[PDB]
Amino acid sequence: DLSVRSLHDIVKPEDFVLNSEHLTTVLVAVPKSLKSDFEKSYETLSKNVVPASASVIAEDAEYVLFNVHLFKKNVQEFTTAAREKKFIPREFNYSEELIDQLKKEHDSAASLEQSLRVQLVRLAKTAYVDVFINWFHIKALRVYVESVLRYGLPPHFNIKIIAVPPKNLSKCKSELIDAFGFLGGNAFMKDKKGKINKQDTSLHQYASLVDTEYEPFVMYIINL
């Protein structure tokens, strides 16, 4: 789309002339309707407009992109005259450094996104494992210390990880509560199930830093 775009990959030595300074090239972004209107008008926009220069070097859906060659002084008259007709000039000259730098910007931008994406996909996967080993280290620690706080002695505990098949968690949690619950409270015990996460209330979050609903024995629920 033309509104900021200047071409740099469709250059040619004759559709784009600037080698001294007498001749220059102005590009004109012309709506499709207006394409005939430009082919007719191009010569009249200023005096000293080079003959038959008006050709569509590039074309898109909304716009057709023209080149016209003309004298440098006359470029001011040309541009203003172009805007009355209700075209929009896009200014690009054929200085060597211009052509090269825009081309470079496309390339340098593809190379930055490319390198980065490969390191970034790799970095997350490598990060993922480390934070996994570390998450379980805290839970193991957390559970151990808690057990000491709630049961007291012995410091030697019987500890298991039980794999529950998906959607049997609530039924599993209840059965454990009935059997073992008496140990940590014979009155501090109620039936409960599943794990609900909230910021409505702080109850039901099973934690020792904010007030929660007291579980009858140490049980922590891991959702993956």
Binding site: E43, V50, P51, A54
Partner: protein, 52 residues
Amino acid sequence: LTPNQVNDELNKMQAFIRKEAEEKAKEIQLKADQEYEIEKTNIVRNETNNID
């Protein structure tokens, strides 16, 4: 555009190209006449004052 108009613009454009070059070249070599004289009198006047 049509072949008669493209030859009409072709004679007009190369008329300007030369004319601009000729005009510029004329200011350039005119100034050269002025600079030769001023600077030539200065170089003389300065050192003839030393000799005196």
